[PDB]
């Protein structure tokens, strides 16, 4: 009779109430994808702050970072699952310009992620890890960046920049060239929907969580400002 209908309606109401309660939490949290090459510093960044899930909260905001080991392959068919994440955190070792080039492989990966059809709105937060090792390599004359990257010979330091309080000009040029390659890749195919935020991080830094928080805030602010005809 109608007893079954009444029971089904009660179950539906309870399920809907639970769904709203869970939806509050789901909309109150932000999902991030940690996607970088192996041994590039992903483990260090995870420690600082099939699938590895790390949840950290800053300023009463829930961030849910997801790092995927998976299988080493270039297809990345699972990348379409992350078309609704707040941002994609890209960790790359900038000191691997001479090692086997690892930097060229990372640039190709960044270009593939940037031009992906599903990731046409997700901004990318870029971490240029192992900064100290890059400085040590640059100071030593064993390896020349111009040899591995021919464009470095014609490159010149930016007129406007932010050099460190104690930094050599040579390592400054190296770091800015490494950043500028990724920035050029980001800008060439960009349409204003998603930007790239490069950061010169080190294994000894402690404020990378603040940097990620600020970049996420900027990402959401720019999304809101672009939804309306502003910015």
């Amino acid at each position: 009779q109608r007893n079954e209908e009444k029971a089904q309606r009660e179950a539906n109401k309870k399920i809907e109430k639970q769904l709203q309660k869970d939806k509050q939490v789901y909309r109150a949290t932000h999902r991030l994808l940690l996607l970088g090459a192996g041994e590039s510093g992903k483990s260090t960044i995870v420690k600082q702050m099939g699938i590895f899930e790390t949840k950290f909260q800053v300023d009463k905001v829930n961030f849910h970072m997801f790092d995927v080991g998976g299988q080493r392959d270039e297809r990345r068919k699972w990348i379409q699952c992350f078309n609704d994440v707040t941002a994609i955190i890209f960790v790359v070792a900038s000191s691997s310009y001479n090692m086997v080039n690892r930097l060229q492989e990372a640039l190709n990966l960044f270009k593939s992620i940037w031009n992906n059809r599903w990731l046409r709105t997700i901004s990318v937060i870029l971490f240029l890890n192992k900064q100290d090792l890059l400085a040590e390599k640059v100071l030593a004359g064993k390896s020349k960046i111009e040899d591995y990257f021919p464009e470095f010979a014609r490159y010149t330091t930016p007129e406007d920049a932010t050099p460190e309080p104690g930094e050599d000009p040579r390592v400054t040029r190296a770091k800015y060239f490494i950043r500028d390659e990724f920035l050029r890749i980001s800008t060439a195919s960009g349409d204003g929907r998603h930007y790239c935020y490069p950061h010169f991080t080190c294994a000894v830094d402690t404020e990378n969580i603040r940097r990620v928080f600020n970049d996420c805030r900027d990402i959401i602010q720019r999304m809101h400002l672009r939804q309306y005809e502003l910015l």
Binding site: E5, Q8, R9, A11, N12, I15, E16, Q18, L19, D22, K23, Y26, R27, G50, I51, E53, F66, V68, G70, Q71, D73, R75, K77, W78, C81, D84
Partner: protein, 331 residues
């Protein structure tokens, strides 16, 4: 070395298929009257999913269906009364497949985490967490109440035993990432389409591949047997759907149009096999007349790409689960 032998065998297989290709499906079915225009309307819309949906599966009775969404929720709907019977939470938010057991008592669920989860509806807790895969798990189907076959990111497809939680047999020998699979009506054979252009056919009992088909030119995202069990249709990313045959290995008919360029995400057959409903990335589905390769209708109404598709066992309703968080049951 063995490369010359492999090339000779491939050439022999191609020559045999050409020798068996005397006629074409189009020529024989040309004299048949066209199916005509089919108009479908959303009889029931199911709402309650917080985000995008990747899978759905009808029950043995056409009343119940289970849908998997990246919310971490596995909701079992009642199609007739648009009521949520169950809303199963998930350990991992990322889910890429779901399955509803023919017995109606068990539900499978797997995602980016390599584990496959089996839930007990009549008792809602994880009966068994089937582990052993390496890549992301892609599809699940229930051979029976105790046996389940899974396809994961790695090249291997595995047949599991729920009671023991171990791989009874493993179907390997493929190249790409396996994306979808479909069981035979007799539950003795199944196929598997993958990112590789090939779509092999596997024997459950023996555990060895029998035939392979390489008609496509891109990744295969969906696959489904003909109701006869003697043929199947695959959905690729090349904006083409092809109907293969088990008896004659060569592809029979191809379903494509110049206007559409987006890939196919999900395919399914009607009860009589006349209509090949296929989901697309153009935010709408297309109903293909299987015997003529002529479009018979358009299933529009989804705000995002359709990622799930299924036709009831009775053949009465067809439901599409898109990245738009809402199901849509047509008729």
């Amino acid at each position: 070395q063995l490369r010359q032998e492999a090339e000779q065998l491939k050439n022999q297989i191609r020559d045999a298929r050409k020798a068996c290709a005397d006629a074409t499906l189009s020529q024989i079915t040309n004299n048949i009257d066209p199916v005509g225009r089919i108009q479908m309307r959303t009889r029931r819309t199911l709402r309650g999913h917080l985000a995008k949906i990747y899978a759905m599966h009808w029950g043995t009775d056409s009343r119940l269906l289970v849908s998997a969404s990246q919310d971490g929720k596995l909701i079992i709907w009642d199609s007739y009364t648009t009521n949520k019977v169950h809303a199963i939470p998930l350990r991992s938010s990322w889910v890429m497949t779901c399955a509803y057991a023919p017995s109606g008592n068990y539900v499978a669920c797997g995602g980016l985490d390599n584990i496959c989860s089996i839930y007990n509806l009549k008792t809602v807790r994880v009966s068994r967490e089937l582990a052993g895969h390496t890549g992301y798990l892609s599809c699940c189907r229930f051979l029976d109440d105790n046996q389940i076959v899974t396809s994961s990111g790695d090249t291997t497809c595995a047949l599991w035993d729920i009671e023991t939680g171990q791989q009874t047999t493993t179907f390997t020998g493929h190249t790409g990432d396996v994306m979808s699979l479909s069981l035979a009506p007799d539950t003795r054979l199944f196929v598997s389409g993958a990112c590789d252009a090939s779509a092999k056919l596997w024997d459950v009992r023996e555990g060895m591949c029998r035939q392979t088909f390489t008609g496509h030119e891109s990744d295969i995202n969906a696959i489904c047997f003909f109701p006869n069990g003697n043929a199947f249709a695959t959905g690729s990313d090349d904006a083409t759907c092809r109907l293969f045959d088990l008896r004659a290995d060569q592809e029979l008919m191809t379903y494509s149009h110049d206007n559409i360029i987006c890939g196919i995400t999900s395919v399914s057959f009607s009860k009589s096999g006349r209509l090949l409903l296929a989901g697309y990335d153009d935010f709408n589905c297309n109903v293909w007349d299987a015997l003529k390769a002529d479009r018979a209708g358009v299933l529009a109404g989804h705000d995002n790409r359709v990622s799930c598709l299924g036709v009831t066992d009775d053949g009465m309703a067809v439901a599409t689960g898109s990245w738009d968080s809402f199901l849509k049951i047509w008729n």
